[PDB]
Amino acid sequence: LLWIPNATPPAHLTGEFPGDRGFDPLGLSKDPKVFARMRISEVFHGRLAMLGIVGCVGQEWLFNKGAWFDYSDFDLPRLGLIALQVIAPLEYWRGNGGFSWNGNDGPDRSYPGFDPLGLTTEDTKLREIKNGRLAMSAMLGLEVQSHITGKSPLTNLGDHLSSPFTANILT
Amino acid sequence: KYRGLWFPNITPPAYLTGEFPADRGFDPAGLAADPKVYERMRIAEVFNGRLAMLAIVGCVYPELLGNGVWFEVWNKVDFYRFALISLQVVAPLEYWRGNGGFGWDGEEKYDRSYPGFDPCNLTTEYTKAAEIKNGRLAMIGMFGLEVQSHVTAQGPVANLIEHLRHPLAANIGANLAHPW
Amino acid sequence: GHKDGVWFPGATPPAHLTGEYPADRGFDPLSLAADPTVYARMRVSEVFHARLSMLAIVGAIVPEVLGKGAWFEAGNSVDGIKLGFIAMAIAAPTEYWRGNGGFNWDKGAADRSYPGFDPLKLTTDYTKAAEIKNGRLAMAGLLGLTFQYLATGESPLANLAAHLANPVGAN
Amino acid sequence: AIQLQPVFAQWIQNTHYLAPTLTAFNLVSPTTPVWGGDVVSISGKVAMMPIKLGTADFLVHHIHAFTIH
Ligand SMILES: CC1=C(C#C/C(C)=C/C=C/C(C)=C/C=C/C=C(C)/C=C/C=C(C)/C=C/[C@@]23O[C@]2(C)C[C@@H](O)CC3(C)C)C(C)(C)C[C@H](O)C1
Numbered sequence: 298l299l300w301i302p303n304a305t306p307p308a309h310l311t312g313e314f315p316g317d318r319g320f321d322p323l324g325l326s327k328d329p330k331v332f333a334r335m336r337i338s339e340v341f342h343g344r345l346a347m348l349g350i351v352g353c354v355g356q357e358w359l360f361n362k363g364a365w366f367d368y369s370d371f372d373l374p375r376l377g378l379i380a381l382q383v384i385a386p387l388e389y390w391r392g393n394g395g396f397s398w399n400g401n402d403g404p405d406r407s408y409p410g411f412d413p414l415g416l417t418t419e420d421t422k423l424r425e426i427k428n429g430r431l432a433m434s435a436m437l438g439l440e441v442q443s444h445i446t447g448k449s450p451l452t453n454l455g456d457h458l459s460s461p462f463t464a465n466i467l468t
Numbered sequence: 469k470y471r472g473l474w475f476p477n478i479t480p481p482a483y484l485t486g487e488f489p490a491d492r493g494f495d496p497a498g499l500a501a502d503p504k505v506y507e508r509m510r511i512a513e514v515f516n517g518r519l520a521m522l523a524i525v526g527c528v529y530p531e532l533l534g535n536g537v538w539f540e541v542w543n544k545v546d547f548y549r550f551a552l553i554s555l556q557v558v559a560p561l562e563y564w565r566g567n568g569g570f571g572w573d574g575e576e577k578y579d580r581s582y583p584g585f586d587p588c589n590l591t592t593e594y595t596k597a598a599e600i601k602n603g604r605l606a607m608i609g610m611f612g613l614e615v616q617s618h619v620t621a622q623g624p625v626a627n628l629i630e631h632l633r634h635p636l637a638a639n640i641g642a643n644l645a646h647p648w
Numbered sequence: 649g650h651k652d653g654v655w656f657p658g659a660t661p662p663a664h665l666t667g668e669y670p671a672d673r674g675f676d677p678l679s680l681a682a683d684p685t686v687y688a689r690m691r692v693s694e695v696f697h698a699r700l701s702m703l704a705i706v707g708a709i710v711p712e713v714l715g716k717g718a719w720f721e722a723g724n725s726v727d728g729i730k731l732g733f734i735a736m737a738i739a740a741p742t743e744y745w746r747g748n749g750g751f752n753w754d755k756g757a758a759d760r761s762y763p764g765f766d767p768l769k770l771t772t773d774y775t776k777a778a779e780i781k782n783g784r785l786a787m788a789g790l791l792g793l794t795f796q797y798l799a800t801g802e803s804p805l806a807n808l809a810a811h812l813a814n815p816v817g818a819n
Numbered sequence: 820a821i822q823l824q825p826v827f828a829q830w831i832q833n834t835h836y837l838a839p840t841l842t843a844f845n846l847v848s849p850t851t852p853v854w855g856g857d858v859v860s861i862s863g864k865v866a867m868m869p870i871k872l873g874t875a876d877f878l879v880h881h882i883h884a885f886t887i888h
Pocket residue numbers: 320321322323324325342343345346348349350352353365366433434436437
C-alpha cells in the first residue's frame with residue numbers, strides 16, 4: 298500500500314504502525330523518537346479535526362446557528378479564559394500520562410483505553426487514522442474556502458451541486 | 469477480591485487492597501496512607517454521605533411541593549433560632565455517636581459507623597457498598613445544587629425543568645458564557 | 649534530627665518527617681505527607697506556592713506605594729478578562745515545560761523544583777530553607793490581605809496605619 | 820382540586836408543536852393541530868383542533884394502562 302505507484306518506501310517507515318503508506322518525502326521522522334511523537338501528534342490532530350468538522354457542518358446544517366466563521370455573537374476572551382481553564386488539567390494529564398509528578402504510570406498516552414465496547418484492534422486504529430486524515434483535509438478546505446469564496450461551506454456545496462462545471466476551483 | 473478501578477489502566481495504591489466496601493483504588497492525594505486516619509476517613513465518608521443523602525431529598529422535595537426553594541428559606545425562617553434549637557437537639561445525639569454509647573468511658577462498645585439500627589437484617593458487605601455509592605452520588609449532587617444556586621439563581625427543580633424545556637438555551641455553556 | 653526546632657514547644661515530630669528535607673519543623677497533624685511519593689510532590693508544590701506568593705504580596709503592595717490604588721481596585725485599571733486570557737495563554741507552554749522537565753515528549757529528568765538558574769552560585773541548604781521560610785510568611789501574608797479586606801474594606805497599608813495609631817482598638 | 824397533571828404528555832405535545840422550528844426545520848407546519856396551534860375548520864365545522872390533557876386525561880389513561888396489563 299503506497300501513496301503513488303511505486304515510490305520506494307522510505308526506510309524510517311517500514312510498515313508496523315497503522316496508517317503507513319510510505320509517504321514522508323521530507324524525512325521528518327528519520328529518528329525513532331521523533332517518529333513516536335509524530336505518531337501521537339497525527340492521531341491527536343486527527344481526532345480534533347474530526348470533532349471540528351462535525352462541529353462546523355453540524356452547527357450550520359443541523360442546528361441552524363449560521364456559518365462557522367461568524368464570531369461577533371460571543372465574547373472571545375471570556376470563552377478563551379473558560380476554555381483554557383477547563384482544558385489545562387486535561388491536556389496536562391494527557392501529556393503527563395497520569396496524575397503523579399513523575400507520572401508515566403497507568404495507560405498509553407495515545408490509546409488510554411476508553412473503550413466500553415472493547416473494539417480496539419489494529420484495523421480500527423487504521424480506520425481512525427484514515428478518517429482523521431480525511432477530516433484534517435476537510436478542515437483545511439473549510440479554512441481556505443472561507444477565505445476564497447467568502448461564504449458558508451454548505452453554500453459552497455450548494456454552488457457546486459447546482460452547477461459543477463461553472464462553480465468549482467476556478468471560481 | 470476482584471474490584472474495578474476509577475480510571476482505566478491505573479494501578480491502585482498498595483494500602484487500598486479492596487478490604488473495605490466501595491474501594492476502587494482511588495487515593496491519588498495519599499490522604500489515607502496511615503491506617504488510623506483511614507479508619508476515621510471511612511467513618512467520615514459514610515457520615516458525610518448519609519447527611520448529603522438527607523440533604524438532597526430535603527432540598528428537592530419541599531420545592532416539588534411548592535413550599536419554597538432551599539436557598540431562599542431564610543427570609544421566611546429565622547436562621548439563628550433554627551440553628552440554636554437544632555444544636556440543642558443534635559448535641560447529645562452527636563455526642564453519643566462519637567462517644568460510642570451513653571457511658572463516660574464508652575462502656576457499651578457500639579460501632580459508630582454501623583450501629584444495629586436495622587430491623588430487617590439487611591446488612592451485608594454489599595449493601596455497605598450501595599450505601600457508600602449512593603452517598604457519593606448525593607455528595608456530588610449537593611455540590612451541584614450549591615454551584616447551580618450561585619450561577620443560575622433558580623431552584624434545582626426549576627433548573628431541571630429549564631434544561632428539559634430548552635436544552636440548548638439552559639445548560640452550563642450558555643449560563644457561563646454570560647456574566648452570571 | 650531537628651537542629652532547628654519544632655512548631656510547638658514540646659512536640660514530637662511525625663514518623664514520616666525526619667529532618668532530612670529543608671525547612672522541616674515536624675508539622676503534619678493531619679498526616680497528609682505519610683506517603684513518601686506524595687511528600688516528594690508536596691515539597692515541590694509548597695516551594696512553588698511560596699515563590700508565587702512572594703511575587704504576589706510584592707505586587708499587591710509595591711503598586712499601592714506608588715499611588716495606583718489597592719489590589720482590589722486593579723480591576724478598574726486593567727481589562728480583567730483580557731489579561732487573564734493572556735496570562736493563561738502564556739502559562740500553558742511554560743507550566744507544561746516546568747512539569748515535563750523539558751521540551752521533549754518523554755520527560756527530561758531535570759530537577760523541576762530547583763532547575764539550575766543560578767549565575768551567582770548561591771544554592772545552599774540555608775538558602776533552600778530560607779526560600780520556604782520567606783515563602784510561608786508571604787502565604788500567611790496573602791491569607792491576611794484577603795481576610796483583612798473582608799473584615800475591613802480599606803487598603804492593606806491603611807490597616808497598618810490604623811494599628812500603629814490604634815494598638816488597643818485595632819482588632 | 821387535588822390536581823394530577825399529565826406532565827410528560829404535555830411535554831411531548833409541546834415539543835411536537837415546536838418541531839417545525841428546529842428539529843424538523845424543512846417542515847412548514849406541524850403534523851397535526853392536536854399538538855397545538857389554531858383550529859382547522861372547513862365551512863363552519865371543526866376538522867381538527869388542539870386536544871389538551873389534564874386530570875381527567877390522566878385518570879382515563881391510567882385506567883387504560885390497567886386494563887391492558
Ligand atoms: C506527513 C508529511 C507531510 C505532510 C502533511 C500534511 C498534508 C499536513 C496537513 C495538516 C493539516 C491539514 C492539519 C489539520 C488539522 C486541523 C485541526 C486539528 C483543526 C481543528 C479545529 C477545531 C478543533 C475547530 C474548532 C471550531 O470550528 C469549531 C468547531 C466551530 C467554530 O465556530 C470555532 C472553531 C474554529 C474553534 C509533508 C510535510 C508534506 C512531508 C513530510 O515528509 C510528511
